Amino acid sequence: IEQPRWASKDSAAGAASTPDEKIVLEFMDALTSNDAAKLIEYFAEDTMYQNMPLPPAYGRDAVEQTLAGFFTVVSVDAVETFHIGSSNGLVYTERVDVLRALPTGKSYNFSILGVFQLTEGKITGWRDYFDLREFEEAVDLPLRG
Amino acid sequence: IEQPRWASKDSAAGAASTPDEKIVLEFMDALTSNDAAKLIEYFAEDTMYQNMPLPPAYGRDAVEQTLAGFFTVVSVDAVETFHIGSSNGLVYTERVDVLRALPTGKSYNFSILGVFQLTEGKITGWRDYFDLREFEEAVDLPLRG
After folding, report:
1. Which residue range forms the structural domain that includes residue A21?
2. For residue A103, is the peptide bond before it cis, meaning its omega torsion is within 30 degrees of 0?
3. Which residues of B are less than 8 Å from A6 in CB distance?
4. Of A13, A111, B15, B37, which residue is the least packed, with the fewest Cβ within 10 Å?
5. How many domains does chain A have?
C-alpha cells in the first residue's frame, strides 16, 4: 500500500525520537506475528485495549483473551505506519492495518488512528479508532457493540 | 458527557499549551455553530478534510461544500474534547461528538480521534477516525464510501 498524499515527513515512523515512540513502533511490527502470547509481553498488568466504541478490555488477562480470540479468526497481514508522534504521555500512530479473515480469505484495509499510553515502557492503554462497518464482516466473532 | 476511565489530566483540553492546540480547540468549539461559512474561515486554500475512509475533500471549496451539505442534514449538538496534544506539527484530539439527525431528531454519540495539520495558523489537513456504522443512518446523505 502507497503513502497517502497527506503524509508528512516530519512525523514519519523512521523519525521516532523518544523511547515510547520506538516501543510502540516495535509493537506495530510485532502485530503481524498473530501471537497473543508474544504480544501480551508489551502490556502492563494495569492496562486496557479498545477498538472504539466496542467494549474495552481492562487488565492484562482480558487483553490477552481478546487478542487470542481475534487471532483465532483474523490474520494481521500488514501494518503500515504513516505517522508516529507523542504528547503529554500519549503516543499516536496514523496507520493502515491489512486484516485477512481466516474463514473466507477476504482482505480488508483499515485506516486507523491509534493512541497508546505507556508506563515505564509497558502499555497501560491502547485505543484504536477506525471504521467498523467492515470489521463486523472481517471478524467472525460477535462484536458485542 | 461523562469522562472516560482512561482520560488523562495531563493531556486535558484545558491544558492546551501551544498556539496550534488552542486554535484546534477553538475550531472544536466552532463546530456547534453548524455554519460552514464560519468554519471555512479556519482553513487554508491548500487543505483537505476526510472522514476516514470516505472520499476526501481537497481544496477549500470542496471542504466548504462538504461542511454545508453535512449541516443541511445533521446538527453538531456538542463536542467534548477529552485529550488534545501535538507532535511534529500535527494536533490530536481524542473526543466525542454528539450529532443529531435533523429529519428524525435522533441523536448519536461518536467516539473520534482526529489529526489536524496547521500551516501559519490555518488548517491544511483534518482527518477524523471513528466508527461509521451509525454515520450512515445519522447522515441523510448518500455515503460515497
Report:
1. 1-145
2. no
3. 48, 117, 125, 127
4. B37
5. 1
